[PDB]
């Protein structure tokens, strides 16, 4: 390429002024808000050297009519009149340039559109809107090829672990053309560096063209090439289908430059200096300060009406983690906080799940969690909804150009995508406000699922910023799913933090520049996941690795959750207590993974600092990618080694909420992923002290040991993959108030003792044991007389209807019971040997082998009693008991909660009389049924359907069957045809067909197809040697009827006491009547609904004897 030339600059007709602080001077044009050049400490950086007195308004070139006033020594103002009659532009904007020390601020301080526009109202011509303002062509700062050390460094979005988003370009003549959007951009010489920020929500496209708030441009002036950094286009008045968006969607344009000399004392001036300085001018995502102390993220899941994780139970998990981590902070995402659980009731943010304890128990959880530094978040959706939701309406639904619905997720029900732009223009904000009003203060984060994939239309930079602002205004921190989502406002990205998702192309932000700037503010990065290669092959800063134990994607591994916190997250979070100050890359390496062989340049040393001038240095032990030392680091703190390879001994000087610890609460954590002795030098303020070591378990600090300090050093030869904590004085474990608010002490058997139970009988026959999944359970076995355990139920309300259940898995034929005595009345329920395996994926005692109770299976099911308090609630007791037997009964979870069911002879309490279930007051689940094995262990596609006329009912969008037969609730199964398996069944603990007695079972049902579902009678454990079943295939209920049909069956209890009834998915094909896809799913061809179940004990007389 030949040396390049361009026009020289004739400034004979230009009048310049200067504005200046004590350190920075800017030469500015009086004709237009342009900076010609900057001076700081006798060094210079150009701005926009060649005048370009044009702006682009609505993508039309306009020569503004400008008037100027120098306001004061640092500040100048420009009034810019904008007129283009052909394009209906008639407006004016005011711009200020202001120097603040080493910063230059560019602000549009006022915009007036002389066209009539009313936010929230119709506009008849959208071209009358003043929708975009661009000052592209006027660089805010630049560097010239004639300057020594001239370089540009910029970041773009990459989520591919093989491909850095960063460009590093020497500014030379000749050089390659450059006209490109960037998220972050720096220019520098050997003397000065500059960074640029803008609030522009411009996009040039997806991928690396998105979040492009800056544009870099090469311009040749005379014999020199300049690379300048411009703000990209800003947005202003916008509409959707003629409806002008709310005023809050308009944010005045702003940009800033910062200019700096060496800022990290390396005696070199480069982008890193600019990046340090940039932290003073940048936006900061709201809530970022919390991130560094949220060490233990996870999800607690509810789904399908089951109430797997009631709000108050989540507090007990918080207490386990508080003990086991010795007080590290937590972040629990409540996926299924609303409606019937996860993926129910979307858009109605304020509909806090009633079956998990409602707003009252949510409020208690938020408040009580504060002292454990445990922050709660919720999962919401702003992209799709279901007929059941209050906010389902034709107007909000997304339609394709052809008029068809854009169908969304199908799982419990068939959802339809919403039009997010319509939503914004029609009151979305108020839905957040309603949640805030109902819930109150103290919620930490809103995680918006799906958003950023386009299901709801535009989910790009501008639309995301608007959404985030609505959430942030309520006091909530923003979190999103995708690695590429929410770059401006997010603090957490699920597919960055859960390293398993998506594979190597779909991870966190692969940018050294961006991570240097923002590592401490968000979990948005590339973590250690060797099989992805590139940046994910042992990042020096770590990166959040999220696992779970409360039901998300079936996850239940408590011990592995904790090991993972210490293996990845403790050091990741340690670094976030500092800001990056220096970043050094090594020589390129060659890697082969994921179907390619490629080059990657790794970081070899990263330094960080804090406001106390502590210095952390992280060094990769080798640049050789084929050496084990490539995947090892050293970490020093003020030169003292705190990590070396597999082991660390790291200080922690912050409480669970991030507050500075008192001196006597300062501690160190030890963790080593390998066996072997390690030796550590103590800091001077430990070297002469006594030192005590504790093994951390789910019981807190254990196995106290005083260490021998020799020559200021300690040596630790401890268990691999086991956390320990060290202190300078003896420590104890506090009272945890297990299960506070739940009316009973420790109902998950987490406290290591049964001493708070009153035990009647031989106490040696009751003990806490661990399941095959390491989950604690009460076990009674080997007893020749009854064994009972009793507690008072505390804190109840007088004259109030309650439910209580215990989870029970009985391997004995002996009676295992739950009994409540209110003082005035006693009620009891029992089970003999359990006969139904547990298929609920989000429940910790499902039958997946790794969750198994014993013998590789789980038959846990909730065993209920229903009672009513009297006037005095000072002596209400709960007793778990077991009659004599050699085999074991296992119990876990005793939940007592308000309930208004009337199942027993039209009365609430457990007792005699005709059994009825109208599904209107279900405590949880699908009682008296339990989900069967039709889908295996799954987020079962059977739940309690909620009415929303007309959308849930026959006729809407051609629906063939009602979701709800009577009242507000029914029992719905979505699409589980042709499975040759049991959809659900009663169990004796929930309804016992007594030996030799006959019952009339009646219900109303909808069925979309003939003989796809059957009513069945069985006994004992169902086996799909297949079990004998009495089979009654059911006809469709709509081709010859305007409503649900009534079914009636006689059932006699087997002498073995183990008779049950249920609904079975036959082998027959369903009939979608020529419909397909979403229409076929929506319309209910493949569905079954039940309501108004009655089971009446009868004596067969007269014509009953004929059938
Ligand atoms: C998918 C996922 O991990 N989470 C939820 C979700 N994410 O949005 C997507 O677009 N996901 C996606 C990922 C890969 C390929 C296609 C799509 O969206 C869903 C709602 O649209 C749903 O909530 C996803 O979670 C699943 O939820 C079901 C129950 O509805 C079930 O619990 C699954 O185990 C979850 O992964
Ligand atoms: Ca430097
Ligand atoms: Ca009903
Ligand atoms: Ca539903």
Swiss-Prot record:
Can you cite an annotated GO cellular component? Answer: extracellular region
**Which positions bind substrate?**
343
Q: Catalytic: where is this region?
A: 287-578
How would you describe this protein's topology in the membrane? Peptidoglycan-anchor
Its biotech or industrial use comes down to: Was identified as a vaccine antigen as it provides significant cross-protection in a stringent mouse model of lethal sepsis.
Localization, per the record, is: Secreted, Cell wall
Q: Which residues bind Ca(2+) 1?
A: 262, 264, 266, 268, 273
Instruction: Report the EC number(s), separated by commas if there are several.
Output: 3.2.1.97
- Which residues does the annotation say bind Ca(2+) 2? 918, 920, 966, 969, 1091
GO MF assignments: carbohydrate binding; endo-alpha-N-acetylgalactosaminidase activity; metal ion binding
The entry assigns this protein to a family as follows: Belongs to the glycosyl hydrolase 101 family. A subfamily.
Task: Give additional notes from the record.
Answer: The hydrolysis reaction catalyzed by SpGH101 proceeds with retention of the anomeric configuration.
UniProt-recorded name of the protein: Endo-alpha-N-acetylgalactosaminidase
Q: Which organism is it from?
A: Streptococcus pneumoniae serotype 4 (strain ATCC BAA-334 / TIGR4)
């Amino acid at each position: 390429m030949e040396k390049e030339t361009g026009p020289e600059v004739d400034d004979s007709k230009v009048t310049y002024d200067t504005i200046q602080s004590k350190v920075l001077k800017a030469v500015i044009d009086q004709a237009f808000p342009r900076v010609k050049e900057y001076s700081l400490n006798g060094h210079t950086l150009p701005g926009q050297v060649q005048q370009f007195n044009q702006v682009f308004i609505n993508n039309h070139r306009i020569t503004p009519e400008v008037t100027y006033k120098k306001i004061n020594e640092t500040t100048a103002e420009y009034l810019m009149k904008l007129r283009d009659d052909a394009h209906l532009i008639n407006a004016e904007m005011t711009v200020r340039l202001q120097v603040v020390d080493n910063q230059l601020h560019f602000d549009v301080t006022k915009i007036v559109n002389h066209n009539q526009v009313t936010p929230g109202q119709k506009i008849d011509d959208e071209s009358k809107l003043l929708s975009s303002i661009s000052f592209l062509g006027n660089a805010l700062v630049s560097v010239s090829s004639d300057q020594t050390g001239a370089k540009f460094d910029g970041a773009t979005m990459s989520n591919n672990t093989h491909v850095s988003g960063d460009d590093h370009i020497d500014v030379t003549n000749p050089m390659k053309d450059l006209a490109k959007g960037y998220m972050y951009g720096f220019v520098s010489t050997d003397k000065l560096a500059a960074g640029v920020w803008s609030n522009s929500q411009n996009s040039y496209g997806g991928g690396s063209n998105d979040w492009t708030r800056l544009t870099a441009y090469k311009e040749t002036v005379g014999n020199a090439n300049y690379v300048g950094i411009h703000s990209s286009e800003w947005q202003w008045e916008k509409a959707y289908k003629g409806i002008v968006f709310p005023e809050y969607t308009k944010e005045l344009p702003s940009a800033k430059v910062v200019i700096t000399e060496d800022a990290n004392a390396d005696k070199n001036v480069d982008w890193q200096d600019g990046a340090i300085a940039y932290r003073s001018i940048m936006n900061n995502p709201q809530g970022w300060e919390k991130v560094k102390d949220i060490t233990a993220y996870r999800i607690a899941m509810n789904f399908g009406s089951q109430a797997q994780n009631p709000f108050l139970m989540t507090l007990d998990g918080i207490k386990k983690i508080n003990l086991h981590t010795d007080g590290l902070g937590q972040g629990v995402l409540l996926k299924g906080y609303g409606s019937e659980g996860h993926d129910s009731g979307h858009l109605n943010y304020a509909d806090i799940g009633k079956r998990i304890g409602g707003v009252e128990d949510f409020k208690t959880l938020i408040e009580k969690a504060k002292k454990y530094g445990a922050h709660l978040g919720i999962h919401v959706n702003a992209s799709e909804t279901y007929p059941e939701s209050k906010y389902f309406n034709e107007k909000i639904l997304r339609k394709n150009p052809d008029g068809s619905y854009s169908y969304g997720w199908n799982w419990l029900d068939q959802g339809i995508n919403i039009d997010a732009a319509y939503d914004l223009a029609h009151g979305r904000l108020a839905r957040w406000e309603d949640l805030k009003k109902k819930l109150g203060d103290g919620l930490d984060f809103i995680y918006v699922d799906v958003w950023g994939n386009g299901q709801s239309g535009d989910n790009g930079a501008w639309a995301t910023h608007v959404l985030a602002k609505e959430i942030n205004k309520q006091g909530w921190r923003f979190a999103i799913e995708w690695g590429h989502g929410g770059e401006y406002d997010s603090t957490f990205h699920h597919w960055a933090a859960d390293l398993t998702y998506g594979g190597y192309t779909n991870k966190g932000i692969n940018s050294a520049i961006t991570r240097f700037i923002r590592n401490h503010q968000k979990d948005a990065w590339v973590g250690d996941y060797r099989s992805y290669g590139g940046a994910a092959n042992y990042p020096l800063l770590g990166g959040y690795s999220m696992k779970d134990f409360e039901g998300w994607q079936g996850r239940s591994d408590y011990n592995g959750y904790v090991t993972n916190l210490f293996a990845h997250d403790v050091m990741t979070k340690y670094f976030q207590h500092f800001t990056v100050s220096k970043w050094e890359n090594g020589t390129p390496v060659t890697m082969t993974d994921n179907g390619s062989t490629y080059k990657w340049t790794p970081e070899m040393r990263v330094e960080l600092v804090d406001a106390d001038n502590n210095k952390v240095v992280v060094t990769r032990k080798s640049n050789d990618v084929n050496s084990p030392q490539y995947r090892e680091r050293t970490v020093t703190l003020n030169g003292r080694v705190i990590q070396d390879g597999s082991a660390y001994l790291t200080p922690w000087n912050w409480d669970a909420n991030g507050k500075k610890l008192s001196t006597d609460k300062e501690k160190m954590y030890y963790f080593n992923t390998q066996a072997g002795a390690t030796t550590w030098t103590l800091p001077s303020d430990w070297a002469k002290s006594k030192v005590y070591l504790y093994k951390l378990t789910d019981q807190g600090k254990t196995e106290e040991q005083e260490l021998t300090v020799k020559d200021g050093k300690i040596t630790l030869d401890l268990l691999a993959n086991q956390p320990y904590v060290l202190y300078r004085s003896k420590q104890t474990n506090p009272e945890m108030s297990w299960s506070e608010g739940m009316h009973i002490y420790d109902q998950g058997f987490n406290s290591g003792t049964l001493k708070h139970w009153t035990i009647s009988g031989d106490a040696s026959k009751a003990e806490i044991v661990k399941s095959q999944g390491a989950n604690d359970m009460l076990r009674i076995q080997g007893n020749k007389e009854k064994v009972s355990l009793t507690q008072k139920l505390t804190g109840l309300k007088p004259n109030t209807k309650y439910a209580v259940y215990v989870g029970v898995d009985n391997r004995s034929n002996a009676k295992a019971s739950i009994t409540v005595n209110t003082g005035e009345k006693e009620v009891t329920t029992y089970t003999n040997k359990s006969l139904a395996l547990n298929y609920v994926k989000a429940y910790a005692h499902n039958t997946r082998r790794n969750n198994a109770t014993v013998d590789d299976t789980s038959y846990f099911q909730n065993m209920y009693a229903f009672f009513t308090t009297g006037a005095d609630v000072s002596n209400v007791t709960l007793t778990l008991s077991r009659e004599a037997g050699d085999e074991a009964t296992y119990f876990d979870e005793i939940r007592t909660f308000e309930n208004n069911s009337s199942m027993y002879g039209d009365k609430h309490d457990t007792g005699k009389g005709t059994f009825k279930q109208d599904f209107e007051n279900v405590a949880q689940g699908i009682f008296p049924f339990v989900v069967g094995g039709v889908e295996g262990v799954e987020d079962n596609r059977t739940h309690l359907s909620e009415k929303h006329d007309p959308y849930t009912q026959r006729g809407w969008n051609g629906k063939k069957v009602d979701d709800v037969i009577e009242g507000n609730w029914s029992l719905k199964t979505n699409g589980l045809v042709s499975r040759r398996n049991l959809v659900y069944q009663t169990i004796p603990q929930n309804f016992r067909f007594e030996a030799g007695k006959t019952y009339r079972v009646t219900f109303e049902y909808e069925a979309g197809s003939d003989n796809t579902y059957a009513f069945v009678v069985g006994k004992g454990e169902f086996q799909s040697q297949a079990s004998n079943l009495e089979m009654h295939e059911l006809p469709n209920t709509w081709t010859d009827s305007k409503k649900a049909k009534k079914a009636t069956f006689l059932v006699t209890g087997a002498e073995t006491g183990d008779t049950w009834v249920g609904i079975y998915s036959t082998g027959n094909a369903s009939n979608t009547r020529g419909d397909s896809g979403g229409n076929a799913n929506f319309r209910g061809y493949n569905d079954f609904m039940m309501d108004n179940l009655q089971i009446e004990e009868i004596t067969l007389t007269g014509k009953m004897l004929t059938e």
